[PDB]
Design a protein around this nucleic acid. Structure first.
Lengths: 174, 215, 37, 143
RNA sequence: GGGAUAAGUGCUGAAAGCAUCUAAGCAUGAAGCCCCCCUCAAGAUGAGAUUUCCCAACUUCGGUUAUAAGAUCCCUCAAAG
RNA sequence: UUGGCACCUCGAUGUCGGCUCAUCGCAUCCUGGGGCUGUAGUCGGUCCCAAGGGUUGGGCUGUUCGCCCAUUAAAGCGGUACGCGAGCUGGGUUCAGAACGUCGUGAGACAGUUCGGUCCCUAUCCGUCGUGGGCGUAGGAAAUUUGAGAGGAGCUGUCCUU
RNA sequence: AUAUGUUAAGUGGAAAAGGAUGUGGCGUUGCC
């Protein structure tokens, strides 16, 4: 549709090689970002690319609008990073680091360990603040949800781990 | 550590070093050698054949199993050993023994206290369902003609048959049973004995296979 | 959630979808969650 | 009066080899069964087997159309009360594909003394190489 | 302790410029499913493997013989029945 | 479940309930995994997944049912000729005797009650539990083994600490 | 086997009130 019929506009700072079926985008802070795509019909150009669906149906429009979005995402992966910030509400909720691991002291009878992985970096702004910085939205989102699922926010006092602002419920026990 | 083969000698008891009483089984292990070393290339699995007790040499006319025959006598001589009764294969070891005979000694069980013991006999004759399977007897208050009988063997008409695995009389005992997590109490050189903490399967003068615990 | 053979919206923020062949209603009120269309 | 009947002396059996890569299970199976029964020979006699031997290479590439890797369960009883085991057609291919093709094809052969001797001429291997090079197996193309 | 999952929870994502756990892709998740634990099992007629032992005389039979390795008859028994 | 029909059986298919011995369904009682809560916490409610194991001992009665005592993590609901008498008992009921209330002029009957009372069998064939012998497995033998497949096990409490 | 369409559940190869942005057809309107 519209979202698939949109220009990508490769900023010409990043190099996207269109190796037959597959796409590999390199930039100042990421290489080997190659993705498995489908049999779409796109132009192999620099300074801008487009994706074109060969046919028209209910199974071409969906994959068109998805392929365009995925190429856009891996272009912006080397264009800049996607940072998801996780906060810790509650007393005595501290995040320690060690090497490339994150220790969470989150109210249990033991710490909780979160090992880093390739292409991503942990960083702790303050004891209650944790930021995961990476190049793929998929990888950053997986890491952030795995770090969030240790103690999701309660609805009463809100203590737990959360993303940004206030989007949570609120109850009143007493 | 490495498994050993032995004979059950009997039960006894010692006194633990704080005053405890410890039931003990005495197991002699002597004459153990490595007769063959099976490897993945020649045979699919990796294992080592050990050989337990010593048989007598070959005799031209032998009417018992005391003397080795020519096939067995030729199988031992390839390891440079003496004919052996009770040849057995140990898997889940690390093959650093020799396919040519080397003594497997009790002194390898100084390290490794918790073991499991495989025994190969218990020994009872044809037995009824109360003995063999632990079933229950009938009453004697009313004039019951049912006491040690098995009971119903199925349902009526809709089944029209007896299911595989029904419990009935038959030869009891004599199976192969392993007791797990037994503990070595003490090893003894100059008698080649191991004192196992508990009780092992089989009768006296039976063959037992000791190996390190798989758990 | 409510597993009922007649799922339908209860307010204006609830909206109907299909996951794996099941019809479902998802809403911003967790009371209003239903499945098994 | 005048109908030719095949005899063991007359029978000349050949060896074929088929590629089960990029084919469907049932569509390959029906044709291999027609080759095994010997209905592809003008000299076909019902009472005695005139069929040929078949070697099926690349068994790990047979495929199923639709949602058949999770459906198409295979059930089997052990004759003891309660024991009815199962395996999906997707876990049987990745584990033991040569049983998948063998059972598929042998379900299309008549269950008679001769329907077993006709079904033990099928050799199924998962992977391009087969030991039976000493029999000169021609390469047959399914249609 | 390992693998794949149910209900559930998700990450990226369009069809549907937004939204969305799903259509493509990627995760996580039960005393339950397949392994791991214990016993049986090559009559598994698809009858498997390894080590070892024995292997000339007579015929035109083209096959035979007995004997070799080995095992029984018979007898003394029990850890077995 | 109480019924409705009257299709098999009257040259005969033994009726309760319990004992002994099981097997199967899930519409789940306990244990395991979750969504919502008028879910503060410890306890609960109500829905969804799940059949792997487990699911008590007595008083009263022929009791199945039921009520009660003491427990338990829990004391699930159903099918198999309301499983099961070539396995057992036989209290009840449907034998003959004899008595009560009532009905009959009567011989006798129950809307009922009460005391009593012969339960047969040396298993052919299929089925199941064990054990051997013949042949096969392209020479004849001794031992040691792989494991396609099959079976077994699978339950839970209470304290201490954080 | 030939020609043109339907569907994707293995429906086909059991069952109702009722519920639903599943997909194909024709028709008819309101804002572009």
């Amino acid at each position: 549709s519209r979202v698939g019929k949109k220009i990508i506009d490769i900023p010409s700072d990043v190099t996207v090689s269109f190796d037959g079926n597959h796409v590999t985008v390199k930039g100042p802070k990421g290489e080997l970002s190659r993705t498995l795509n489908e049999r779409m019909t796109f132009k192999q150009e620099e300074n801008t690319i487009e994706v074109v669906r060969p046919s028209d149906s209910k199974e071409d429009r969906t994959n068109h609008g998805t392929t365009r979005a995925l190429l856009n995402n891996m272009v912006q992966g080397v264009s800049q990073g996607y940072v998801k910030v996780l906060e810790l509400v509650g007393v005595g909720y501290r995040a320690q680091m060690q090497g490339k691991d994150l220790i969470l002291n989150v109210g249990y009878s033991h710490p909780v360990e979160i090992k880093a992985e390739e292409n991503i970096t942990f960083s702790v702004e303050k004891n209650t603040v944790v930021k995961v910085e990476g190049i793929s939205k998929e990888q950053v989102g997986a890491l952030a949800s795995n770090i969030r699922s240790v103690r999701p926010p309660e609805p009463y006092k809100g203590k737990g781990i959360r993303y940004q602002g206030e989007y949570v419920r609120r109850k009143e026990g007493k | 550590t490495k498994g050993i083969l032995g004979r059950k000698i009997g039960m006894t008891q010692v006194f633990g070093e704080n005053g405890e009483l410890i039931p003990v089984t005495v197991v002699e292990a002597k004459e153990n050698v490595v007769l063959q070393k099976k490897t993945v290339e020649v045979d699919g699995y990796n294992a080592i054949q050990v050989g337990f007790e010593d048989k007598k040499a070959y005799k031209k006319d032998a009417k018992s199993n005391k003397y080795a025959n020519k096939p067995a006598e030729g199988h031992a001589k390839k390891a440079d050993a003496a004919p052996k009764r009770f040849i057995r294969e140990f898997r889940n070891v690390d093959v650093d023994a020799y396919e040519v005979g080397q003594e497997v000694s009790v002194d390898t069980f100084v390290a490794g206290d918790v073991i499991d013991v495989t025994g190969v006999s218990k020994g009872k004759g044809f037995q009824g369902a109360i003995k063999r399977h632990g079933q229950s007897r009938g009453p004697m208050s009313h004039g019951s003609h049912f006491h040690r009988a098995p009971g119903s063997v199925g349902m009526a008409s809709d089944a029209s048959r007896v299911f595989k695995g029904q419990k009935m009389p038959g030869r009891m005992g004599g199976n192969t049973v392993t007791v797990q997590n037994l503990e070595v109490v003490q090893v003894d050189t100059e008698n080649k004995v191991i004192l196992v903490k508990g009780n092992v399967p089989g009768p006296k003068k039976g063959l037992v296979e000791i190996r390190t615990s798989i758990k | 959630m409510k597993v009922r053979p007649s799922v339908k919206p209860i307010c204006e923020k609830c909206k109907v979808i299909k996951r794996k062949g099941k019809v479902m209603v998802i809403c911003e009120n967790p009371k209003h969650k239903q499945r098994q269309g | 009066r005048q109908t030719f009947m095949a005899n063991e002396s007359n029978i000349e059996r050949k060896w074929y080899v088929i590629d089960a890569e990029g084919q469907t299970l049932g569509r390959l199976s029906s044709e291999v069964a027609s080759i095994l029964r010997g209905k592809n020979k003008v000299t076909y006699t019902p009472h005695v087997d005139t069929g040929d031997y078949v070697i099926v290479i690349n068994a790990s590439k047979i495929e199923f159309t639709g949602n058949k890797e999770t459906d198409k369960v295979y059930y089997r009883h052990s004759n003891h009360p309660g024991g009815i085991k199962s395996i999906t057609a997707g876990e049987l291919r990745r584990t033991n594909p040569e049983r998948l093709i063998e059972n598929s094809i042998k379900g299309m052969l008549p269950s008679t003394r001769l329907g077993e001797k006709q079904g033990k001429k099928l050799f199924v291997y998962g992977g391009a190489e087969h030991p039976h090079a000493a029999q000169q197996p021609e390469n047959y193309e399914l249609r």
